[PDB]
Design a protein around this ligand. Structure first.
Ligand code: CA
Ligand code: CA
Length: 725
RNA sequence: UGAGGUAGUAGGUUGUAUCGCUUUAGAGAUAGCCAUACAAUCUACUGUCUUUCU
């Protein structure tokens, strides 16, 4: 089926244009940037129980810098959620227009390989480092302040002590004797990443140092109580001896092994702050009594990389993917006005749920459903001077089906730019400077499969974001650019008396004829001066839905689309429209040949409600209450604000009752009280001339209600059943 | 913050069955938006258990 959720198809991953053809070249200008980490949201000690110090990225002065051959356009300050709290990352230029030589540039490239292959462990048999066939390639090099304090410059005395050390890829060859006892230097291990030598010869385990335990010595650690001392442990399990028995033990904690840092660990998947209320004493006791690795400096080789830069390196996958999460492919916004929405907002008009990062596609597309319906409806109602409700409902439903929405999103190119998968850097991320998967002589490193429904939903969320930001001219221009055309959008013996009603509603009509149209049938032909109240019911149902949805969206209560649509249906049900049209006296001006239809419900409501239904609901009472809205709208130069001004006094107590009482239909609530045994019997005409429905739930007998149709009959039966429960 | 497994919570996702509301074409049908119950599956957190590391 063309727009079915089932029809999945395969789609590649687009490359931000700035991050392609981006390899630095000899005698080619570079653009040195800076990641710009600054810890502007520490974590609280009422929220952190690691029992471990916080490390701001400002304690030290060496930082990572991209070296694209292409200029990066400034991106909104985005956060990453490291061990030390929400870090606001800012990729802001540091220097530009300088030329490098060959030797230093090959040094840069070798350090880039060392970083992604050796440091981050993103090397797989399938992936081969080729920075000349790769599709996204740029160096990631360290920066420091030397000479002038203001200047940040490429470290060359660093990146040259990585080529003069032999503890980088292997373990240094060293010889310790009892005649030259091992000597300890505190400054060397102050910020150190240490690798154990006695084990994991294939792939060693890295751990940055975070403390020095001075009281702890090689003779008293006893961590696992089956061993007489610490030194005897290396001696029996590895047969290693120590030449210095007065050195301290070197407390230590792992390098981060999971490199998805775009989500917070102790908050919801909603962007909502929520600390846990359980294990409060236990979390502190946990990191206290838990086994913790206490290495020894004798046997651990110090990397040529200090912890202060390893900490900025670990965050490079997430930072280089969020900068890549179309933040730099804001070409969508360049193609699409008050300067457009923030690229942070457009990244919620491309992110689909089950991408689990803190943005949902929905709660922004529901508002898009109401505007597109309203825009299509208004465009039709004014495109043609004559069309019955059947024709317009036909035309509309074709221009707004999921099939057509899908066929318009994919034509734009929206499926590659989307975010459909969860971020796993080793499994489905292709790091920069790496050529697409092959080493073996469909793939998860450059393709993804998305349903046809999801393109049709993002085409809605994008409209929602442009709308809620730039107004209602921007949403219309956006749709018009997709392809959906929305932009080119005796008679004084029964008209006198409308002055009282106009004074009741506090609006005066520039042309009274619209009030007349809003009150005459398409079968009552005594009034031939004006047209039927049928086209107006169409515009008014769309508008009163758009306005109610915009109000509901603008509330700080932040309703999920489920509750939002439940409310929208709770107040646009035509029973309420009948009640509000008879309360404020719409019927007394309403010319019709209805014999006794609305009189019963009028007396019913005016007697019982003096501050569910036991009587039939007139179609007219419900449809005049919302043809008046269309009449105001079409009279007041197509202005939603006069309509909302006139209608908000009436609807205000109703809205502030329903946004707290959130009503629902008796049939659905019955099938939610017990769906196992509840079912409606097929229609069958009784001896009254009615239609009856037989309903049962076990234990309370059988229920029924006669009506003029199957829907009304089962509704009455459901009410009868639900009153007893 | 080593590789797993097993329960719960939170956020999703897929399929299937019963369904609500708005629109109307001539049990029920067209086109939109949810909810509910069962099942499969993924991510983040907490605890518990095995292995490893200290
Ligand atoms: Ca939709
Ligand atoms: Ca209607």
């Amino acid at each position: 089926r063309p727009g079915s959720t089932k029809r999945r198809q395969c789609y590649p991953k687009a490359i931000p244009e700035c991050l392609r053809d981006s390899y630095p070249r000899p005698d080619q200008p570079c653009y040195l940037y800076v990641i710009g980490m600054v810890l502007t949201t520490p974590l609280p000690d009422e929220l952190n129980f690691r029992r471990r110090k916080l490390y701001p990225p400002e304690d030290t002065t060496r930082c990572f810098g991209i070296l694209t051959a292409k200029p990066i356009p400034q991106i909104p300050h985005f956060p990453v959620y490291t061990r030390s709290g929400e870090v606001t990352i800012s990729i802001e230029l540091k220097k530009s227009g300088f030329m490098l030589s060959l030797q230093m540039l090959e040094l840069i490239t070798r350090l880039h390989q060392y970083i992604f292959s050796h440091i981050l462990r993103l090397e797989k048999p399938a992936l081969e480092f080729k920075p000349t066939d790769a599709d996204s390639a740029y160096c990631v090099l360290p920066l420091n302040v030397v000479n002038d304090s203001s200047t940040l410059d490429i470290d060359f005395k660093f990146m040259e002590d990585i080529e003069k050390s032999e503890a980088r890829i292997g373990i240094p060859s060293t010889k310790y004797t009892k005649e030259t006892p091992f000597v300890f230097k505190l400054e060397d291990y102050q910020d150190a990443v240490i690798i154990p030598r006695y084990r994991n010869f294939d792939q060693p385990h890295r751990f940055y140092v975070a403390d020095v335990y001075t009281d702890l010595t090689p003779l008293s650690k006893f961590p696992s109580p089956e061993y007489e001392t610490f030194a005897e442990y290396y001696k029996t399990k590895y047969n290693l001896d120590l030449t210095n028995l007065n050195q301290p033990l070197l407390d230590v904690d792992h390098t981060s092994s999971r490199l998805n840092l775009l989500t917070p660990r102790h908050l919801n998947q909603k962007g909502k702050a929520l600390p846990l209320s359980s294990a409060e004493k236990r979390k502190a006791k946990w990191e206290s009594l838990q086994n913790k690795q206490i290495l020894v400096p004798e046997l651990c080789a110090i990397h040529p990389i200090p912890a202060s830069l390893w900490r900025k390196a670990v965050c490079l996958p997430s930072i280089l993917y969020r900068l890549h999460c179309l933040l730099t492919a804001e070409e969508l916004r360049a193609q699409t006005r008050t300067l457009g929405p923030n690229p942070g907002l457009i990244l919620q008009a491309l992110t689909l749920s089950n991408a689990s990062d803190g943005f949902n596609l929905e709660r922004l597309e529901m508002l898009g459903d109401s505007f597109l319906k309203h825009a299509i409806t208004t465009y039709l109602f004014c495109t043609y001077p004559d069309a019955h409700e059947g024709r317009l409902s036909y035309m509309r439903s074709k221009k707004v089906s999921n099939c057509n929405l899908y066929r318009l999103g994919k034509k734009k190119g929206l499926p590659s730019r989307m975010v459909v998968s969860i971020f796993d850097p080793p499994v489905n991320w292709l790091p920069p400077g790496y050529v697409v998967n092959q080493d073996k002589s469909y793939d998860l490193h450059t393709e993804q499969c998305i349903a046809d429904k999801s393109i049709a939903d993002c085409v809605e969320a994008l409209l929602g974001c442009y709308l809620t930001s730039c107004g209602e001219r921007a949403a219309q221009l956006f749709l018009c650019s997709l392809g959906l055309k929305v932009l080119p959008v005796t008679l004084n013996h029964l008209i006198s008396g409308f002055e009282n009603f106009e004074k009741k509603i506090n609006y005066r009509f520039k042309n009274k004829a619209y009030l007349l149209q809003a009150f005459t049938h398409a079968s009552y032909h005594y009034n031939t001066i004006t047209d039927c109240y049928q086209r107006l019911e169409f515009l008014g149902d769309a508008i009163l839905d758009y306005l109610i949805t915009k109000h509901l969206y603008e509330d700080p209560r932040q309703h999920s689309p489920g509750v939002l649509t439940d409310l929208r249906s709770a107040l646009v049900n035509n029973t309420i429209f009948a009640s509000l049209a008879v309360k404020y006296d719409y019927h007394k001006y309403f010319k019709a040949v209805s014999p006794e239809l609305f009189h019963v419900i009028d007396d019913f409501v005016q007697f019982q409600l003096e501050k569910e239904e036991d009587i039939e609901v007139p179609k007219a009472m419900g449809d005049i209450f919302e043809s008046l809205a269309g009449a105001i709208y079409m009279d007041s130069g197509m202005s939603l604000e006069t309509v909302w001004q006139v209608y908000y006094p009436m609807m205000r107590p109703l809205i502030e009752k329903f946004s707290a009482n959130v009503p629902r239909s008796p049939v659905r609530e019955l099938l939610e009280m017990e769906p196992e045994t509840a079912k409606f019997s097929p229609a069958e005409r009784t001896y009254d001339g009615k239609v009856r429905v037989t309903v049962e739930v076990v234990g309370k007998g059988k229920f029924k209600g006669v009506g003029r149709s199957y829907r009304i009959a089962k509704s009455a039966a459901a009410r009868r059943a639900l009153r007893s429960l």
